[PDB]
């Protein structure tokens, strides 16, 4: 390798650049709180502000002048004995305390307090009661989370009567509980990832000094990523989510250790060939730095493709991951190269402690090259057979199962299910806004008509309205009923203050937040549409909000955005591979192999999670797993292809086989480390994060064991001359004469 | 047509590139993996490397029948000198 260029500058400025990176670590970790704190205090919303459900609920609050935010929490009062007057006193005290704290509580629907709707709130057996509290801040935001914590503190402050307990649950409470669970599990997941990385590096390098230096590289790179993202989130530059924090920590550590393994393996291979420290470092840089730039570009762009989605979870997953991975890759390429440079001078720190294993990988490359068609067919079948999990794959949105059952929201749901149906604690708000006054006899006949119509919709269990204070009470209201003080209270609680909109509480029959709820939302909307049709009040709006409509918007956006982001990631990673290798065919092969490996990863992860774990796969697991797989598997294929291109000078088949012999151990070690670090999410209390990690780990195990090891070199050997189009590359070179004997 | 010594030297150099067995060990009167310990898949490796960097074909059908380096060098001779 020629001693010049960026490698020379990093060589001479190794110590100053280590000092600069350390100073950056200190600055980013001394002026801004840690990633967990900023993620908790700068969490992104759950659903976009432009979503139909969010605008519907905001319109609910604006018209009814009760709240201004999309966040609801249920307060379940579960008692061993039937809820008597002492339970009513306790509930009234809770309501008064909540109204005394308007900073976090915007409105409280006193259904149980008013006798007219009291039986509506009580359970059928009369053991449990629930009250809705509309808090401040959109669901999932830091404001909503702190509102939920304030509500929980308020509930716990009031002395509950003996035999009666109160729990705070609901969607906003569920998001706050998922944040709490992630804060609980971040320490253990980081400790597990450290232990796994240390164990794998001890197994691979077998040198204490080498593993300590690599660990310093990885920890400082991860600190750089975490500090940069915390700085961005703290100054409100970018959104952030707890999903982003956990996934960023693990991807940062895993990719940093992969870059460390790449550089150390190349340096040790160069040393084992016979090159001295200077030449070995220069060769390692000139043969791996461009690979690491490409790997970082692929990961950053793949995550950035999520920034162009619609939901705020993927929006806050895109840019923060892109910036964090870019910081990780810059930290690797600069400070890891500098650390290798400085440690090369210091004795024999990075000198390999054992002969590198090439004979096995060289034999495997021979098997791949000589018979590329059978190997390629075998690996294609082995990677496509995973797609057998599609007829039966489920994408349950039920976030209750993905959180620990001891959390306040999960315990509240557990108390609810012991006396209520699963749906009655996740209701839906509907209304119609008349252009005229709604306090009229014919208007209430129309209201009763639409209530009956929405009740007759299949899958809807309970409907609550002015004419139906409970699940179920020729109809006619005489004018004298308008002056009834109880009826006036029911009016104020169900009608808009100006008497132009009437609210409806809708409770499903099955799970409201399962696909049945999504197919129920449109049915409710259309049914109300023809129920209001042919009426003097026709011409109103049908804003329907709640958890079911929210998940309907999220699921349609999830499907469309996952498809478009997968396509964008494919195109962008292909563009990056074409930029690096200057070979369109090689880039296409890398992308296709990663796609088929993704199919296998989907099959394996769906199998394990939905069939032996028993927990159905979460919806965002697919998107994050796809993005991370397109990043990392393509990165491994890029490293292999770059090594092949370097080795081509001796020939195509022999180039592939020499590249495999030289890089098989390095790539398999890196892939094992990354996959095991991702599977280290299996201990995360966020079962969705565990699903993401296990899916990515299994996918990358497939990538390194069979995809990178067999599929990519088999395609390369099968194609040959055309594998490097449009770069004019020959077949086996001109036959050299047989050398004179020595 | 290349003679014995240069082809043996080329095979010895490719063994160096493969395993590292010293060149003077290879001799056209000795034997193969039952003597010098390079596996059948690593015969495939030897054959593909010698197809690439030396431009002489080796079929899998004839590979199994080669059990001395003398046998493979003889195959090289009667595959090269036939135009």
UniProtKB/Swiss-Prot annotation, chain B:
Domain Carrier stretches: 2-80
Modification after translation (UniProt): 4'-phosphopantetheine is transferred from CoA to a specific serine of apo-AcpM.
GO terms, molecular function: acyl binding; acyl carrier activity
Cystine connections: none
Positions of post-translational O-(pantetheine 4'-phosphoryl)serine modification: 40
Cross-link type Isoglutamyl lysine isopeptide (Lys-Gln) (interchain with Q-Cter in protein Pup), residue numbers: 78
Keyword Ubl conjugation: yes
Gene Ontology BP terms: lipid A biosynthetic process
Gene Ontology CC: cytosol; membrane
Main location: cytoplasm
Entry keyword annotation includes Ubl conjugation: yes
Localization in the cell: Cytoplasm
Function: Acyl carrier protein involved in meromycolate extension.
Identification of the protein by name: Meromycolate extension acyl carrier protein
Taxonomic lineage: Bacteria, Bacillati, Actinomycetota, Actinomycetes, Mycobacteriales
Gene: acpM
Entire-sequence positions represented here: 2 to 84 of 99
